[PDB]
Design a protein around this ligand. Structure first.
Ligand SMILES: O=S(=O)(Nc1ccc(O)c(-c2c(O)ccc3ccccc23)c1)c1cc(Cl)ccc1Cl
Length: 210
């Protein structure tokens, strides 16, 4: 049912640096997640050129931002290419094809955490604002999976069946008590306008029911 894995040592070290480094400019987390979504959307768009059946799991190419003050979550949804189980475990749990090593060296030599996206590890900036991250994903060649981690060196993967998404990735950010500014409509719009105004897919900010 639930499988537990260790992060590769360098990934756990990087996460600990993000959790533990004093750094006020936390808002860049949202840019880095939107940018991974946009990348995943380019890839499905590209594939569907030579095989239009890749869109049978959904034609719309977009990014949805879903704040929920009651649950204290901000969720980033995209309809990009998604990840298989193996891709999820490698992509989130190992250095894989990222510049994890170069980033940690860079911060020692004067880079700052705002530059994390240059090294293909921008995802982990989620831990600037979230105590826990859940990544739900569905690739055309696999079943739906949920990855989850509150850091501390491990993560879990299980199958996810309540709510099939079609195709793509949802990142759910269980925000820290002091990071609820990122559920405010005004704050979200400001950050999207500041850092993500050129993304080439519709970004829809959901309104809250209460
Ligand atoms: O080039 S990618 O493989 N693109 C890609 C493909 C499918 C995906 O579902 C995603 C993706 C998303 O669509 C959304 C959030 C993600 C968070 C961490 C890693 C990948 C995410 C990104 C990739 C992989 C990694 Cl580990 C980090 C960034 C990127 Cl752009």
């Amino acid at each position: 049912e639930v499988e537990t894995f260790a992060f590769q040592a360098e990934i756990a070290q990087l996460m600990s640096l993000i959790i533990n480094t004093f750094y006020s400019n936390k808002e860049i987390f949202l840019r880095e997640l939107i940018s991974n979504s946009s990348d995943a959307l380019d890839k499905i768009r590209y594939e569907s050129l030579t095989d239009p059946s890749k869109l049978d799991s959904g034609k719309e190419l977009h990014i949805n931002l879903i704040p929920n003050k009651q649950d204290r979550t901000l969720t980033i949804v995209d309809t990009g290419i998604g990840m298989t189980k193996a891709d999820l475990i490698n992509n989130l749990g190992t250095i894989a094809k990222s510049g994890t090593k170069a980033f940690m060296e860079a911060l020692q030599a004067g880079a700052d955490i705002s530059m994390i996206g240059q090294f293909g590890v921008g995802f982990y900036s989620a831990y600037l604002v979230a105590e826990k991250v859940t990544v739900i994903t569905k690739h055309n060649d696999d079943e739906q999976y949920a990855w989850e981690s509150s850091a501390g060196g491990s993560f879990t993967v299980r199958t996810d069946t309540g709510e099939p998404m079609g195709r793509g990735t949802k990142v759910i950010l269980h925000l820290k008590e002091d990071q609820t500014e990122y559920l405010e409509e005004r704050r979200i719009k400001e950050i999207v306008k500041k850092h993500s105004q050129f993304i080439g897919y519709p970004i829809t900010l959901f309104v809250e029911k209460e």
